[PDB]
Nucleic acid binder design. Structure first.
Ligand SMILES: Nc1ncnc2c1ncn2[C@@H]1O[C@H](COP(=O)(O)OP(=O)(O)OP(=O)(O)O)[C@@H](O)[C@H]1O
Ligand SMILES: Nc1ncnc2c1ncn2[C@@H]1O[C@H](COP(=O)(O)O)[C@@H](O)[C@H]1O
Ligand SMILES: Nc1ncnc2c1ncn2[C@@H]1O[C@H](COP(=O)(O)O)[C@@H](O)[C@H]1O
Ligand SMILES: [Zn+2]
Ligand SMILES: [Zn+2]
Lengths: 378, 378
RNA sequence: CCC
């Protein structure tokens, strides 16, 4: 008696995700037997057929777990089912959840309904079986669909510090990018490359005016907040001063200058609120030597540099160990959910009840405040 | 020789229903091992306030099927999953459907996504194992949720002859009962007793002015139609003309006397259109020698006999042998789903693909049009 | 609010 396998389902987002983990030693990272992600945008490019997310998951979760089980050769083998319970569109959630319930009942095996974000949080620990980073740590999630700063004290205890009020970073970046006629799968990945290439070049006379909501450095309300929806409007009007119309016949020298400044400012804003948080509550961060930057936009170098430079020498004699997962794990996927559930199962010895329905809005601090949880055995 | 068991799921109504069937022999009727129904009420008024039916289904399917699998003694025994694909609310539907698919992937067994009404039509064939009634036959579906007349030429070939354009006879005999001073599970069944207990003792001088959906003249739907939502009103307008709440404090002789007439005038309307359709389309019925009347309200004895007598009018295109299934089969349940699945699997050698999604509104004629179906090896 |  040693080793268990885990079937993990993620459906909070646009992409249906299924994975299988062989948790062969409680001493070692699990091995990934199967990792399937069938996206809403992957049936569109070579598709021109636009589907609705809850229907996408409904249609793809069956064949996907079927494929996964075959690839993994593990149908008669799963021990735990983990599944994203919230937060998200409760249609898209019920897709995965009600299905995951099917597996569990059919197999007579435990189900864990997991916090989407706890996945993002806990993923950079899978690599080392939860030795790095050790709690407490802080984690900046920066995806197309979240932008949040989170102190994590224990597995059963997490506090959101700073959080967006409008859209997420990647969204607004992608949006700015698309207004400059980028089209790609990841619009802002493309726009970094663009800036990267011809640096000592771009019209240094172009100095557009972008904001960075520093009011929280004066009129402080109730919680601290990121905010990105202001950027695309600020771009448009700066265009509407100097050639919005020129959209097209600007040089492949200038367009690469609107880019770097749009990026710089929006990364300035994050750094601004990050600064304003650590400054104001040194007590909480006293005890933490590690900083995670997971999510999509983790993989930006300009950001990574700013983070390492403009923070990790401001908390006095407590540099930060920055850890950046592979964006192999940073995008939504069902692996994080699997890992997160191994951590719950092992460390709390909790599972979910079969009556758990989805949770539209699920504050991370309410992780175990909600019903569903029961102790496993002892 | 070999037999097989079926797990069948019905999640289209308000009630969460699951069944296991032993299809032990292809020359016998199958037996039921397990049949449960978690009615929406039992987790509302005795819990908190009124709960949405999709969350009901989501909350109850899993515990419910676990139990049924325990009772049936067959968690490892199921060879086929039958579940209601449509028609209804896609949130309700998809609770059971997404779940059902989970069972199917985990046990690696076929799924059949079943049409609710196919359920009701076929169920009388269950007991005789497909011999009685023989195709063609017509069926009259009179539940709290349907009032519909149907010709059935083959498993895969059903044609709706007349259908309600508003509420169903049940919903209508219920509100009428509610207004006469009744409550309960079957508000209208009760109304039957009140007049039954003392069939003679009723003020034979209380004649009431109820209508019969006044449209034998001014309407251009290509198709014949029932309607009931007038009767509640007619009754009210009438109870004005000769004493409001009098009902509540009238003799045994009067509460009944009007109830008999309301119950008459509704059945009258039903026999009326039933007659229209038998008259309009004579040779549609050429070889029909069987009339099934099923659904909640089919248990009523004035109906049963109005049917028997008033389409013995002049026995013409056919002389009908009536069949009235029990109420434990007529009211929504998962057994009829399971049976429909048997029929489909065995006769048509068909199953559903795991990509099947709900269908909100599913024409019975389109039973096999829609996507999903796939041949075993006919 | 809600499939
Ligand atoms: N006005 C409408 N426009 C588009 N779809 C509609 C409309 N009214 C009803 N629908 C139907 O309802 C569903 C779409 O709406 P719904 O909000 O339930 O889906 P969604 O946008 O993907 O949300 P969620 O993912 O949270 O369930 C589909 O099943 C669709 O057929
Ligand atoms: N180098 C990069 N610069 C800017 N955005 C990026 C980069 N790499 C990835 N992204 C963004 O990452 C997001 C992916 O979100 P998710 O799939 O949730 O990680 C997309 O919106 C991308 O535009
Ligand atoms: N003996 C009866 N006479 C008239 N209506 C009935 C009788 N029994 C049950 N019903 C009705 O059955 C309906 C519910 O539909 P069903 O889904 O078939 O149970 C309710 O409207 C009841 O009032
Ligand atoms: Zn995410
Ligand atoms: Zn029904």
């Amino acid at each position: 008696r040693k080793g268990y396998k885990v079937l993990a389902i993620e459906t909070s987002c646009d992409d249906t995700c299924v994975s299988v983990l062989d948790r062969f030693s409680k001493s070692a990272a699990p091995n990934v037997l199967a990792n399937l992600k069938d996206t809403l945008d992957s049936i569109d490019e070579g598709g021109i057929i636009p589907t609705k997310a809850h229907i996408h998951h409904q249609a793809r979760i069956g064949p996907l777990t079927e494929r996964a089980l075959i690839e993994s050769n593990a149908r008669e083998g799963i021990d735990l089912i983990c599944v994203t319970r919230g937060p998200g569109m409760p249609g898209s959630l019920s897709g995965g959840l009600d299905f995951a319930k099917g597996l569990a009942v059919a197999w007579n095996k435990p189900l864990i309904g997991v916090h989407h974000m706890l996945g993002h949080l806990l993923i950079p620990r899978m690599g080392t079986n939860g030795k790095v980073p050790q709690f407490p740590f802080v984690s900046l999630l920066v995806s197309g669909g979240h932008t949040t700063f989170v102190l994590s004290r224990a597995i059963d205890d997490h506090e959101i510090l700073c959080d967006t009020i409008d859209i997420a970073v990647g969204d607004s970046l992608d949006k700015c990018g698309r207004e400059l006629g980028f089209k790609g799968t990841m619009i802002a990945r493309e726009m970094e490359k663009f800036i990267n290439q011809d640096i000592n070049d771009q019209d240094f006379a172009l100095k557009l005016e972008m904001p960075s909501p520093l009011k929280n450095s004066a009129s402080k309300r109730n919680m601290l907040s990121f905010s990105f929806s202001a950027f695309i409007t600020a771009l448009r009007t700066n265009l509407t001063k100097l050639g919005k119309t020129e959209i097209q016949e600007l040089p492949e020298r200038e367009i690469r200058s609107i880019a770097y400044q749009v990026q710089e400012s929006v990364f300035d804003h994050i750094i601004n609120k990050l600064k304003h948080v650590l400054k104001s509550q040194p007590e909480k961060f006293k005890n933490v030597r590690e900083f995670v930057c997971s999510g999509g936009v983790s993989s930006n170098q300009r950001l990574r540099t700013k983070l390492e430079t403009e923070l990790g020498t401001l908390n006095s004699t407590s540099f930060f160990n920055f850890y950046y997962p592979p964006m192999d794990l940073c995008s939504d996927n069902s692996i994080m959910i699997g890992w997160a559930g191994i951590e719950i199962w092992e460390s709390l010895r909790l599972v979910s009840d079969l009556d758990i329905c989805p949770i539209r809005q699920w504050p991370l601090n309410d992780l175990l405040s909600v019903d569903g949880w029961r102790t496993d055995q002892l």
